Design a protein around this ligand. Structure first.
Ligand SMILES: [Zn+2]
Ligand SMILES: [Zn+2]
Lengths: 288, 283
């Protein structure tokens, strides 16, 4: 069974999976993601060697290793396999291009809407990497002369407005002022307010919450509009835990403010589970 | 002299030229830009056979025609020549690629900064045209949730801020309140707003700081989308905006994209050069 190993060096955890050619995630390991790199590489090797060994047991011909994020040298040497590496935003795009709603499409965008915001740009069937390799930094599209502060150091970034972290900051500010919870809401002692709480408050009648969310969706929307006026893609795939939430307002912002010339674009929510791993996998699968 | 027939369609006058493969504008014909397309289409073919007639007298093989902006139908039939067509922004870019500071560059962007704002994106030595052929509508990058109104109907467009019309609108405003003229000067417009600024006016300077910032933020948006190796500012207002654009980037773009070079264009009649370049790029 033709396959590849996919590695996801993401938030908190480090995941490695055996992925089939048809996109099935055969087996999936998750572990702590060491902060320091010397150690992160070691863990990857081990998890790969185990995954690889298992693939031999599980009747799987592994073609190579793909990594979403000096990683190539040590892995190829040890595992006797080719290694491909690209960033999470690009891998998200590649997941859609191979297994998702990007199949076929010549020119499309994948915007990751979760803890943070990022994305990938397919054009002429291929990723746009950029001269400095850092193309498609979609979280730091600036839609304000004087916005909220952003973790990149600037302000106005659509990540500063519409990220999961962004919303959590807003959710905490209101809860600290006793302006978040409404008509019954109760937060656990352990758990701590986040975007769902902000949304639930809005959906349960919280005007302050609704306002905050309106701005976050508008900013993101204008982010997408900027993409449309730059790339004129045929499709935009919102992906991640906040995609479902943001799709309605993004379309509205597109109907409201985008040029007539680019309104035939379609915006969708991704169906893909574990896109990072699928994307990592898709590099190996595609080449070999 | 292996050459091409460049043709320009812009505001006010209509232009036509013979352009060498080297990039030399041999002859240039200007004229009126009629009310109607029936009037406008009649002039073009006449200017072309006029020009096409001359070319041969100046020993020049016209390989075809190029047009900035079913016109191939009348011309190709009449002139017996391949005719290419593409918009002003793209031609601005193609001009820089074949003849300007984009020579050899895989990924760069040309941003027109004049009466309007617009441009072209060259990625992998090629134009991005897009899904519905509306790529690089750069003047309508949004940098505000509540900006100035724009010609497109929306608001917060960099064109709405930094265009020569944008600046002209602001020039009329101040001058209506008699607060634009300042010790040292005597149809109001952008160039005056700049002098008033230069020669001491704070409201002028204030209006400009915002304009230049809005534009730079647009440029930043481009950098974070495309990660180009170079950004060429082209037009009557390029010389003006380049310093502030360089600053907004310095002050707000990611470390990753700071290696970008911003430059002002060298080309004269880039519209015509870009048009001609289409004919010359398909030999
Ligand atoms: Zn940012
Ligand atoms: Zn506009």
């Amino acid at each position: 069974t033709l396959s590849a190993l996919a590695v996801d060096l993401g938030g908190t955890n480090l995941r490695v999976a055996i992925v089939s050619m048809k996109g099935e995630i055969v087996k999936k390991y998750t572990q702590f993601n060491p902060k320091t790199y010397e150690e992160r590489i070691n863990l990857i090797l081990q998890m790969c060697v185990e995954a690889a060994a298992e693939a031999v047991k599980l009747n799987c011909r592994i073609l190579g290793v793909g990594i979403s994020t000096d990683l190539r040298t040590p892995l190829s040497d040890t595992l006797h396999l080719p290694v491909w590496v690209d960033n999470d935003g690009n891998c998200a795009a590649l997941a859609e291009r191979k297994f998702g709603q990007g199949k076929g499409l010549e020119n499309f965008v994948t915007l990751i809407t979760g803890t943070g915001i990022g994305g990938g740009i397919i054009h002429q069937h291929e990723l746009i990497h950029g001269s400095s390799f850092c193309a498609a930094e979609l979280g730091h599209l600036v839609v304000s002369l004087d916005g909220p502060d952003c973790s990149c150091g600037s302000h106005g970034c659509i990540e500063a407005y519409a990220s999961g972290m962004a919303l959590q900051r807003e959710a905490k500010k209101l809860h600290d002022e006793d302006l978040l919870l409404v008509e019954g809401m109760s937060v656990p002692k352990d758990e701590a307010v986040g975007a769902l709480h902000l949304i639930q408050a809005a959906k349960l009648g919280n005007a302050k919450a609704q306002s905050i969310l309106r701005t976050a969706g508008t900013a993101l929307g204008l982010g997408v509009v900027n993409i449309l006026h730059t790339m004129n893609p045929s499709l935009v795939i919102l992906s991640g835990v906040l995609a479902s939430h943001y799709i309605h307002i993004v379309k509205d912002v597109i109907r409201q403010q985008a040029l007539s010339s680019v309104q035939d674009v379609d915006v969708v929510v991704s169906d893909l589970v574990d896109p990072a791993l699928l994307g990592a996998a898709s590099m190996v699968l595609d080449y070999t």
